[PDB]
A paper describes a structure:
Overall, folding of Rc-NifF is conserved with respect to other flavodoxins, consisting of a central parallel five-stranded beta sheet (β1–β5B) flanked by five alpha helices (α1–α5). Rc-NifF displays the highest structural homology with the long-chain flavodoxin from A. vinelandii with an Rmsd value of 0.55 Å Both present an insertion of eight amino acids at the C-terminal of the 50’s loop (NifF insertion) following the β3 strand (residues 65–72), previously observed in other nif flavodoxins. FMN occupies a cavity located at the C-terminal region of the central β-sheet with the isoalloxazine ring stacked between two hydrophobic residues, the Leu58 (β3–α3 loop) and the Tyr103 (β4–α4 loop). However, while long-chain flavodoxins present a Trp at the re face of the isoalloxazine, nif Flds carries a Leu residue (Leu58 in R. capsulatus). The presence of this Leu at the re face makes the isoalloxazine more accessible to the solvent compared to non-nif Flds containing a Trp in this position, which should provide a major stabilization of the HQ. Rc-NifF was crystallized in the oxydized state, but, unexpectedly, the 50’ loop was found adopting a trans O-up conformation, which should favor FMN reduction in Rc-NifF. Rc-NifF presents a basic patch adjacent to the FMN-binding site formed by Arg16, Lys17 and Lys20 (α1 helix), Lys33 (α1–β2 loop) and Arg39 (β2–α2 loop). These residues introduce large differences in the charge distribution on the surface of the protein, which change the orientation of the dipole moment with respect to other Fld structures reported so far. The eight-residue insertion present in Rc-NifF comprises five backbone carbonyl groups (Leu66, Leu67, Ans69, Ala70 and Ala71) and one side-chain carbonyl group (Asn69) protruding to the solvent.
Author numbering: 1 to 182
The structure:
């Protein structure tokens, strides 16, 4: 019913809180309430033509899920449920949570798997983010000096999250038809 679907994966609530912060900025007409992918219905997920998806990186640079030692199923188990769906015509923006100090070689790698998955199915992906403001040495989520989606780090750069969400949401505002609060 809402224009933008908002889904996330999360083990310790960090990504969930961010998803909520994002929703707090827009009206029910433009964006739906944040929902954990382990609660989502395929038909419910497939209805939106615009999607904002968030995910942390766990285990060993993996998507959250039971194989990554998450307390509950997450993106890992959800993707197969929609692997046969076509995402052509759908606009998707990704945000990832990670810890650049503790995992300098796999910073927000989960973003790559998410991007690859929807990209391989015709989705229009937007929201690349400059990688200069981060300290890391390697990442599957970096292409041409930019992260495949917004990168957030509540472990080391929590103070930067507000300006990053304002700036990033403004970046995908054109594609998504969003209007940021003053
Ligand atoms: C066992 C474990 C592994 C992690 N692996 C990575 C990693 O590979 N890359 C990364 O950027 N962050 C990694 N992190 C950091 C988390 O993604 C980060 O703390 C995030 O904020 C957690 O999100 P959540 O609270 O939504 O689960 C790891 C954290 C833990 C506890």
């Amino acid at each position: 019913m809402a224009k933008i679907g908002l889904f996330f994966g999360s083990d310790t609530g960090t990504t969930r809180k961010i998803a909520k912060q994002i929703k707090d900025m827009f009206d029910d007409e433009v964006m739906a309430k944040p929902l954990n992918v382990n609660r989502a219905d395929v038909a419910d997920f497939m209805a939106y033509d615009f999607l904002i998806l968030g995910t942390p990186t766990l285990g060993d640079g993996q998507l959250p899920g039971l194989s990554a030692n998450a307390a509950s199923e997450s993106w890992e188990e959800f993707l197969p449920r929609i692997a046969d769906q076509d995402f052509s015509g759908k606009t998707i923006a990704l945000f990832g949570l990670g810890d650049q100090v503790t995992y300098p070689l796999e910073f927000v790698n989960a973003l790559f798997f998410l991007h690859e998955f929807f990209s391989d199915r015709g989705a229009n992906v937007v929201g690349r983010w400059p990688a200069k403001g981060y300290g890391f040495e390697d990442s599957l989520a970096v292409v041409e000096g930019e992260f495949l989606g917004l990168a957030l780090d509540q472990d080391n750069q929590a103070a930067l999250t507000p300006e990053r969400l304002k700036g990033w949401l403004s970046l995908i505002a054109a594609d998504f038809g969003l209007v940021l609060p003053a």
